[PDB]
Write a protein that binds this ligand. Structure first.
Ligand SMILES: [Fe+3]
Length: 54
């Protein structure tokens, strides 16, 4: 699945890994993340992520 980078800190949200420590099971697409999910490292909102795709 896709990977998205936090433009502030460089954390990669990997849809295959999810973010289970913050309530997100593996396989959750970035668009399916709750509106108040933030970067687990720096706290940036979803708006600050970019999909790693051409
Ligand atoms: Fe971040």
């Amino acid at each position: 699945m896709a990977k998205w980078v936090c433009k502030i800190c460089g954390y990669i949200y990997d849809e295959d890994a999810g973010d289970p420590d913050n309530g997100i099971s593996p396989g959750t697409k970035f668009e399916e993340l709750p509106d108040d999910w933030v970067c687990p490292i720096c706290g940036a909102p979803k708006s600050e992520f970019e999909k790693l795709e051409d």
